[PDB]
């Protein structure tokens, strides 16, 4: 068996749970067959038995590093099926917290990558910044992560009176924090070695294996679903996709540090130009009525009672809506009968495709190389296992 | 608009510059300077028991059932808190109290089943079930985590003052 | 009733670019100080 050796489920190196049954001739990897489902939990079947609004919390758990960006994908999908679109302020919010979430994911991906490599100080440096961001989530949603803030018809509640100012102070400084990590890793005489020329993926092969993420962008293919197919108001902002050449672990990394930088450019704008308005559609049909209204107006109570107890009652149809979640293209194919509860909801996980590529990326590579490549794919087993 | 993250003569000055970088580990020394710098920064940690990480009014935390000032428990067993709970956590069975009013004989939130979504907070018309601020309710035994009406009502009485302040701060938003 | 919005006139500007400083002793100068140290030590 060429000394087949399970990478093992319990391994600090393996994000979450990954059995990589690997046959290694000494320290060289001949074949990697990743095993999955150590975190399958039924998210796709469970949703069929739940109403649209009570299936929103499942999406936050699908890939919870990127808590909200995932919600936006279901939101968009349910809005399309209803042919309803959120109010202008809600759109900007979703882009505001959409980006904050991208940073949160990249701080995880870059710093967790280093911890497996062996650099441990970048993680503590940026987890403090993460912490500060979580607090935004909490003061907007109530939960540090797993908010449930972005609902199918807009966000749930307007921003607290004062958040924008703090999402500024932080943004005004975070840059230096990214700069520091840099002075520690971008040019380390050693980061480069373990990362450069490891897991190079061709451009044609990346499209073929459905990579669709930084992994494509790192190989030089220019595709950001946020510029190619704008969703929400990511069209009204101006940002630069960080394309890469000589795609390899180091290049893609540089790309993830660059989108952390570009997201600060998008966050700034959102703070500078967020409109006065409502944060949820005015159709009591889709969005729950305000509590003052349901406690004084009969039509609002009836609409509150029916919405919470039964549901949206989406018109029959099916849609595949994909956003640019921090990992890559996150899409929900939501088939829907006229009923208030969905019929199918295949979650396309940027990650099911990326893991598959582990085999075609880590060939003739050492045990340490495999650890570096799992990092450069930002694998969150929640999205892959669903 | 796109950007090239890493897209790219040999002069003694240049080479000598590059060779010194490899020979005397110049960039490695650069990295050491950064960590020495923070060693001098104030640490961000908080004494956990003495100082607590800040949570604003919407923090969901631990379930509680409120009561009217008068002393009549708010819940009127409409049971849509049960309907919208995503995890099937809340179990409610009711019967008309002798007063003739409508009250819940049994209200059981299984906290291990609950995923603290906060929709129950949302759904209640009388707002009887609220997400209370406390997050520290870790328990030695699994049974303690299952909560009946008496624990939640008791939880409600203990934290009513802060729950009232929290709802006071956030109701305009809702 | 008030809604948290950007301050009038907009917020100030943020940095979105690496400000890593290319600061170092020039290589020749670097080697010379070192070789000079060994020469003095040998003598």
């Amino acid at each position: 068996t060429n000394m087949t050796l399970n990478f093992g489920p319990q391994h600090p190196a393996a994000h979450g749970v990954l059995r990589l049954v690997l046959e290694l001739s000494g320290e060289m990897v001949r074949k990697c067959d990743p095993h999955i489902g150590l975190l399958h939990r039924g998210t796709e079947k469970l949703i069929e038995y739940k109403t649209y609004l009570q299936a929103l919390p499942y999406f936050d758990r699908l890939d919870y590093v990127s808590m909200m960006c995932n919600e936006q994908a279901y939101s968009i999908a349910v809005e399309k099926l209803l042919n309803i679109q959120p109010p202008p302020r809600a759109q900007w919010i979703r882009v505001l917290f959409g980006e904050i979430t991208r940073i949160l994911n990249h701080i995880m991906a870059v710093t967790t990558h280093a911890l497996d490599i062996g650099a441990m100080t970048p993680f503590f440096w940026m987890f403090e910044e993460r912490e500060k961001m979580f607090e935004f989530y909490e003061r907007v949603s109530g939960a540090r992560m797993h908010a449930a803030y972005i609902r199918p018809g807009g966000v749930h509640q307007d921003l607290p009176l004062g958040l924008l100012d703090d999402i500024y102070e932080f943004s005004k400084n975070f840059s230096l924090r990214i700069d520091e990590v840099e002075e520690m890793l971008t040019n380390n005489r050693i980061w480069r070695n373990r990362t450069v020329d490891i897991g190079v993926v061709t451009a044609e092969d990346a499209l073929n294996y459905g990579f669709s993420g930084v992994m494509l962008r790192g190989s030089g293919i220019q595709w950001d679903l946020r510029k190619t197919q704008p969703y929400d108001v990511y069209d009204q902002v101006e940002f630069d996709v960080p394309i890469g050449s000589r795609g390899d672990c180091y290049d893609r990394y540089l790309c993830r540090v660059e989108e952390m930088r570009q997201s600060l450019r998008i966050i700034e704008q959102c703070l500078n130009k967020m409109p006065p308005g409502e944060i949820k559609v005015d159709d009591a049909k889709v969005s729950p009525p305000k509590r003052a209204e349901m406690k004084t107006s009969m039509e609002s109570l009836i609409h509150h009672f029916k919405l919470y107890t039964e549901g949206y009652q989406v018109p029959p149809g099916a849609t595949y809506t994909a956003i640019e979640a921090p990992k890559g293209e996150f899409g929900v194919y939501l088939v829907s009968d006229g009923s208030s509860r969905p019929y199918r909801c295949k979650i396309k996980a940027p990650g099911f495709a990326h893991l598959a590529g582990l085999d075609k990326m880590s060939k003739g590579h050492m045990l340490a190389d495999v650890v570096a490549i799992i990092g450069t794919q930002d694998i969150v087993f929640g999205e892959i296992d669903r | 608009t796109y950007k090239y993250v890493n897209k790219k003569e040999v002069d003694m000055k240049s080479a000598t510059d590059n060779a010194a970088r490899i020979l005397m580990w110049t960039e490695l020394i650069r990295g050491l300077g950064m960590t020495l710098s923070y060693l001098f920064r104030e640490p961000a940690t908080i004494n956990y028991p003495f100082e607590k990480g800040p949570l604003s009014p919407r923090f969901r935390g631990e379930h509680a059932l409120r009561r009217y000032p008068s002393g009549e428990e708010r819940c009127i067993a409409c049971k849509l808190c049960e309907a919208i709970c995503p995890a099937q956590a809340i179990t409610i069975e009711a019967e008309p109290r002798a007063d003739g009013s409508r009250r819940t004989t049994r209200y059981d939130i299984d906290m291990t089943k609950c995923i603290y979504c906060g929709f129950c907070q949302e759904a209640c018309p009388v707002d009887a079930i609220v997400e209370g601020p406390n997050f520290e309710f870790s328990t030695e035994t699994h049974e303690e985590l299952l909560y009946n009406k008496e624990k939640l009502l008791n939880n409600g009485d203990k934290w009513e003052a802060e729950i009232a302040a929290n709802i006071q701060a956030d109701y305009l938003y809702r | 009733v008030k809604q948290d919005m950007p301050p009038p006139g907009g917020y100030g500007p943020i940095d979105y670019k690496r400000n890593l400083p290319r600061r170092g002793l020039s290589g020749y100068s670097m080697f010379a100080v070192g070789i000079g140290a060994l020469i003095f030590g040998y003598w």
Partner: peptide
Amino acid sequence: SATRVIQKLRNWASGQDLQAKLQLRYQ
């Protein structure tokens, strides 16, 4: 809140001004 000398050791070792973007959030 750190002596300028110790603070300097920081700025020098870092190569940029942390004073402007501190780790301690204040009012």
